[PDB]
Design a binder for this molecule. Sequence first.
Ligand SMILES: CCCCCCCC/C=C\CCCCCCCC(=O)OC[C@H](COP(=O)(O)OCCN)OC(=O)CCCCCCC/C=C\CCCCCCCC
Ligand code: HEM
Ligand code: HEM
Ligand code: HEM
Ligand code: HEM
Ligand code: FES
Ligand code: FES
Lengths: 254, 254, 432, 433, 29, 27, 179, 181
Amino acid sequence: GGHVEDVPFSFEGPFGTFDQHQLQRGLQVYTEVCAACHGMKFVPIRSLSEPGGPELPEDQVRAYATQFTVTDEETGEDREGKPTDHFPHSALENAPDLSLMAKARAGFHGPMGTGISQLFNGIGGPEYIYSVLTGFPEEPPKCAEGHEPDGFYYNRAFQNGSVPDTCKDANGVKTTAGSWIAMPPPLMDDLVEYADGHDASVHAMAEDVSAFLMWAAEPKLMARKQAGFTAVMFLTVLSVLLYLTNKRLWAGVK
Amino acid sequence: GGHVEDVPFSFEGPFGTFDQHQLQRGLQVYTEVCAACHGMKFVPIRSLSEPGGPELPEDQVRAYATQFTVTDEETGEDREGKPTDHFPHSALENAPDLSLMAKARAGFHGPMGTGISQLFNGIGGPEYIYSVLTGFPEEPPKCAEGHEPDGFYYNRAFQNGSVPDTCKDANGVKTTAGSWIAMPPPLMDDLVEYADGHDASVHAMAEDVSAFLMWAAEPKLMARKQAGFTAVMFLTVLSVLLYLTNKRLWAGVK
Amino acid sequence: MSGIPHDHYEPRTGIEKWLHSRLPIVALAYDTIMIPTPRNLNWMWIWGVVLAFCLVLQIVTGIVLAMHYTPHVDLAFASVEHIMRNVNGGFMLRYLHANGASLFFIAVYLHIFRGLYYGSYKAPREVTWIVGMLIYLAMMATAFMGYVLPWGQMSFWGATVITGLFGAIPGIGHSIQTWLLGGPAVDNATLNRFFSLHYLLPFVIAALVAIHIWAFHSTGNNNPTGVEVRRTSKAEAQKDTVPFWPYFIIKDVFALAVVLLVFFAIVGFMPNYLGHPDNYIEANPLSTPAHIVPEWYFLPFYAILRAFTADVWVVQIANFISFGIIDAKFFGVLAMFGAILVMALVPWLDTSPVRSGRYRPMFKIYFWLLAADFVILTWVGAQQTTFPYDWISLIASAYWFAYFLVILPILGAIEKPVAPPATIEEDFNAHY
Amino acid sequence: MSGIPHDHYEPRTGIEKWLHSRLPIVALAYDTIMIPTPRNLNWMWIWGVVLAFCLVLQIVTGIVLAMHYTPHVDLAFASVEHIMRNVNGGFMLRYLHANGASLFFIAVYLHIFRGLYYGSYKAPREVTWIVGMLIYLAMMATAFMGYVLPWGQMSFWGATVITGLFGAIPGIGHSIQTWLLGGPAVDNATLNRFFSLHYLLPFVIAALVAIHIWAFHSTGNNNPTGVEVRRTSKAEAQKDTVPFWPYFIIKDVFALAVVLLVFFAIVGFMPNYLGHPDNYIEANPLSTPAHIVPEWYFLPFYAILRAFTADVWVVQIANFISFGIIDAKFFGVLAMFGAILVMALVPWLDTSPVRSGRYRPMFKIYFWLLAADFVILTWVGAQQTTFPYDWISLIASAYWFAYFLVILPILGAIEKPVAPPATIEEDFNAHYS
Amino acid sequence: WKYRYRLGGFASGALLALALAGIFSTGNF
Amino acid sequence: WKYRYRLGGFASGALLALALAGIFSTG
Amino acid sequence: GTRRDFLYYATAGAGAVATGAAVWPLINQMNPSADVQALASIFVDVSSVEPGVQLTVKFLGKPIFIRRRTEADIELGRSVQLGQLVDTNARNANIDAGAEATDQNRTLDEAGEWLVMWGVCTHLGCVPIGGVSGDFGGWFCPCHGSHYDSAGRIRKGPAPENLPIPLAKFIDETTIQLG
Amino acid sequence: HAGTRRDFLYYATAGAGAVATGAAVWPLINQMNPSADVQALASIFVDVSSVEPGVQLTVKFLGKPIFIRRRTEADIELGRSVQLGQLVDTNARNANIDAGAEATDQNRTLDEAGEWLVMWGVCTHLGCVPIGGVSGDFGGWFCPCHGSHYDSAGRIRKGPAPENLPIPLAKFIDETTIQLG
Ligand SMILES: CCCCCCCC/C=C\CCCCCCCC(=O)OC[C@H](COP(=O)(O)OCCN)OC(=O)CCCCCCC/C=C\CCCCCCCC
Ligand code: HEM
Ligand code: HEM
Ligand code: HEM
Ligand code: HEM
Ligand code: FES
Ligand code: FES
């Protein structure tokens, strides 16, 4: 993963939480745009009503579910989707499944492999997702304008792509910060209308989907934070009372 | 099934073995007649070439497999059968799978719940199969001469079937020995042309196919008996040596 | 060690002395194998070694089979057929594990009835008896969950019935049932957790067996006379006893070998006789087979469960006085557990001072009646619930309970026992 | 037991009379827990209790997870998602188990380096050291097989690399690899047998730990001075010792509570930091990740493995003299095992009679070099095998062998140790006057 | 009497552990 | 000389088990 | 002073809770997971059948019976008086909880032709074998020999309760909703 | 005769117990050897077609994709239009040939007549299945995972690193069509 813009998402840090509205916006954008190619085969549709997620009402989740056509795993007949179904697999064969992409990508590295950057900044998966979505320039790098691979697009964040020979340094080393990706620039200004009138810039939509994809990768992050706090409190109290008991005991021998 | 015919089969007893030619005849009978309705989803077709079975040449098994065609996992589409494929599922959903039928049925019972009949006669599985195949009489029991079910056929070996209330008893349970089975009488004399010129009577074909289904249920009966003999010999030698050791050792304590 | 006068281990080889000064593992092993053992033991004492063998066999075959089984309701039956059909020796390994569970329950029923006859549960041996009861309960759970694993028709409907038993507990029972199931029905959650627990519990059984061995070493072995080894001196102890190695090690290994000759003969030539054909049918939640019969070692308890129908007078009384809190369902479940509970309490219910039953001329009768009753309970378990088998099973269950709760307390108050020998040496000499 | 004068258990209450006469389990427990322990132990003696806890944590979380995981390639990753997503607390149970493996390995490395410094491997404790090494090897195998179980990209390709090492062994290696895998390649038979063996080995580890605890109860604890407790009398023994309960039980449970406070902070607020993100990608046997890194506690041995190549002079010599039977691949595999073996043999390689490194003024330098070198191997194992990391890896690997095979044998001839204090009581009173 | 110092210890530990975990469940630091 | 009977016995008992389990079961 | 063992019990308390709070999740993870919770409600509709035979339909992991009873079984003289049953409750989700175990309160229709039930024996959950098995018509449970009459009412054996009637209603004369 | 000695008898019993052990252990480790997997070496018979992307298939063998390629209408032409000195990855590196050869266009083939050649679809120097279909401008393959292009002969010239698309055991090829054995 290429070096990301350090987006200040609201869920970061021990007290960070998901904004339900931002999650709903990201879900909307995913539904209107990304679901054309990317699946979420590990995400159960019923999770849309789960506490700490979008918390859509159950009838609205049911309405949402019915838009999908599901080959019934027992009947073989095609039917409307149900909340107990998962999101479809990726319709486009080479589009990666997004159920875990916000965990399956690191945006921060090193320095020198020491990992301290990931220690402070976290893994940076949402920031990577945002950087890819924001990473299509208005025009290619000035080098090798005659050699762009057909059917691919330059992205500043993507590092796994093909690179023209003319852009490779003689050592086989990438001169460009980015590389060419098969993903066409997916977002466009005001592409999705937020009914509340929220900002529909590409940056806003990219952030909202990055937050939604973070929730898709860790729906129970909130509960993990709360268990973390309650455990830390129990072990703090236990630590202090054991320290005082140890001190009282060992004072008796010296 | 009660009062199954105790057919002598060559594989019976500890020295019993499969007749390879009887197995090939049973395979032919199954393939031409029975395989239309029933399947053998647990039997790998390649096993027809393996020792102790029909032991067909691998090129013949490959030709045999090509008669099938299967929805291959990699192509998602109908693809001609290969020896690594299994036999197909039952084409008629009503018809049970035969892969284990010769083990899943008891022909012998009691006396008086003691299990001694099974202790001498064995489980009676292929004997039960033969009795069911041979079990269709020429004439119904005449208790429901105008009153028997239409979609079902009386069989004197089958016990789980429906019974007409004129044949049924409240005081007892059931007048007739058998019951009515949904399977039409499957065999007819000379229905299968044995290229060997062997007897193709209903009796002979029923024996041959029952032996084939026995091999289908226990394809390694031969190896199991060989291992039985080997272990019995080792434990006999060890038991005699341990007896003489114990006697010569305890003769000191006298 | 045991309180029998004995020679302690003495390291003599250089490596022996180097190790013994650092870890007395060899000293403990020597003490374990050299324990002075009563010389008058008969063939009923072999079953402890056969039980250890059965445990080792079932563990090792489980571990091997666990490399190929798949604990999923779409794959379990197919993976068992894969074991039966493709794996090198897999058919034999599976028939070994399946018949070994029967061998194991045979050896524990003979070990139990030995202990009951010779009074091996009496003081000071109540603790080794209790550890034995824990071992037996763990074996029962292990074998049940193992039998659920093939996901045949019998596996599925057994898993259904047995989880219903916990549902029978008034009030909380539905919670325990749904916690065992993980849901409203037997499904993949049940199979997968039953696999995990069937893997776990044999190691618990092994640790309990280790504690059982330590317990009986700590008391010393009982013997057919029930007279203790003379503790006075080495010279007297050596007359009453002989070292366990080699004499009884070789005796037990001989008996094990001759038992396994029949075991491997069965596994070779008739491995399906003890099983159920219906478990070769894939589980079908929509139709129960017409031959619902537990694996044979559970049949006495299944018989006791079935014996108490709602018309049984004691059940009606209990239902009345409980104001409906007890019913035939819950009464039957309580009885089916009481059958084991009351057997665990036998060290305290037997009031008699005399240890060995062979000097108890009335006790012999009720004991052999109990053994016949246990056979009847096994046999009635396989029969239908119609007349007369309802009466037979009810009478059998009543005698089972009456033996522990009435007959044993009375006999110790009224029996006129014979005088046992003065010493084990005397008995051994009298028999040569 | 240990030879230290001590009070045996006597049953007090009637119930204690009834049990103790029948089964001395309470007596054994008392004799274990009341063991007289040197007064001068420092915080480096906590790690055994941390390890004992970690074994319980791993066992109980594994058993819980084993109720929900499915060992099949079509279902394993999906069942791990089911754990993360539908099971009550299943996310925490997984993260606890995965980070608890790292906790377990850092604790064993601390416990080993404590032993290496204070000389707890020396006579009469060689058996305790050997049992420790067996425990460590069983942990290594357990953790590897466990890391294969989730069947991500890193699980599959790491297994494919590591199982490839057995393929290096001349002649038999192809048979050994095939028997391990159950085929030519990492596949469902590998996942299922690895699941079975991963369930099995924790109980074998627990048995070895029981033998380990019996071994040290059979020798008594070492202490920072290396000076043994006075066997002469109960008076002198008590002057040198205090009972393990309550003093050191409460000390170690306090230190455990602090270690678990930091562990649960990690598990709460950053559980994915130790993991590898590519293991959130399903195994794709066609498409290798850009860089396969085995997880951190394997890296120093994987570093040693990669550090030797046909470019290396000693490898060229080994190839020449072996007629190419020792190719660089098998040389590297032999080195990777030799690194663990030579640490196992350390009770016989350190010739010096002085036990504690505290009094060995030159040994301290080479020990702290070995510690830095272990850190360098851990870090270099993650780096790409180009210049200069090839040099840093080769030099570190060479120093690892040079420490056990050369420096330790020579120091026992050359070193001029300080004189230890006369007794543990003196050393204790010197701090706590 | 004596036991209420023990039991009061028992009770004191209970409320203190629960209350502090409750406070942090308000998430307001 | 020593190991006359001990070694000879061991090999005899081993081979005999291998013989009588093989040939009579196979033939 | 005694504040020593005050402190020692406070630390012991913090300990026993820290362990106690660790143990409960190991139990609660076996309670029904949110997917199994979600399957607790399902919608389905099922069609017509000839008289004298029964269907079966899966729901909630268990069978639903649908029998269209014979003339002999819709009538049975209605001979069973309410005072000779074992269980006198209708066990019917479609009517009040004070309903009695009467033939018409068991059936779904007014004539008594249509009887819809859980196919689950109220003893321990086995499927009762139907046709006209048992000694009172109706069904017979093979597992412990409980007998149900033609109305699915418990007559003999270990079962405590009549076969429960799920929430179900006709949509058309040809089909019946279950959810 | 055998000796009358007791220790003779004792050691004979130890021998019988030793072999009764060894014959019991071997099945427990043998079962871990391949079982159903040995039939992964299937015969891969297919119906014929002319034209290279017609009959030729990415078909799975040894659990992994393969290419079997008649040098029909592009591969022999381009094979007769790429020099041995143009290729990078040199040695024949081939199991169906007996011994090495430099950068050879044929002898990658089953036959010295060189009418069929075969290679693993699983491009193995890292891991990919490069897109065949005679595509890539030497008429061979190109790798989306890695960016190499391949000779129609299955041999590397352009790309980050030189390894040829590797050659498995194949022959017989008799029914005008894909076959293995
Ligand atoms: C299988 C391994 C299981 C391990 C379980 C460990 C559990 C730890 C949880 C609590 C233990 C906490 C520390 C207790 C320290 C006691 C120290 C001690 O030895 O003294 C006992 C001390 C007497 O002192 P002396 O022996 O005379 O002098 C000491 C110097 N010779 O006895 C006491 O009066 C204090 C005993 C403390 C409680 C012991 C019983 C604990 C059982 C249950 C209590 C838990 C209640 C929890 C309530 C929940 C509250 C949130
Ligand atoms: C895993 C199964 C078991 C094993 C491996 C085992 C092991 C042993 C062994 C080796 C002995 C000594 C030799 C002998 O008496 O045969 C023994 C004795 C005994 N066992 Fe078991 N046992 C098992 C189960 C049981 C059970 C289920 C019970 C009863 C509930 C039981 C109760 C006893 C008793 C009372 C003794 C006699 C002890 C004495 O003589 O002092 N054991 N056991
Ligand atoms: C106390 C020792 C054990 C007992 C009494 C026992 C009993 C059983 C029984 C009765 C079955 C059913 C077999 C059948 O009839 O089809 C079974 C199956 C099974 N057991 Fe065990 N078992 C034991 C140990 C183990 C262990 C330790 C493991 C795991 C390592 C294991 C793994 C399995 C598996 C995978 C199956 C299903 C495959 C099969 O059919 O064999 N078993 N067990
Ligand atoms: C020595 C103690 C143990 C160690 C060091 C250990 C280590 C590990 C590791 C490192 C993983 C990979 C975690 C990941 O990154 O996904 C794992 C997974 C796993 N372990 Fe363990 N383990 C231990 C004990 C156990 C036990 C006793 C079981 C019981 C069967 C078990 C069952 C599992 C299962 C099912 C998985 C895969 C599912 C998952 O947790 O992700 N483990 N183990
Ligand atoms: C499962 C992991 C292990 C556990 C639970 C364990 C347990 C223990 C415990 C409780 C102690 C006493 C307290 C202490 O000294 O910290 C101890 C000491 C010791 N351990 Fe371990 N150990 C483990 C692994 C190892 C390893 C990997 C080694 C090194 C190869 C090792 C070598 C030693 C030595 C030399 C001692 C000192 C013995 C003495 O002082 O006489 N242990 N161990
Ligand atoms: S389970 Fe249905 S009658 Fe008992
Ligand atoms: S792996 Fe495709 S040529 Fe590089």
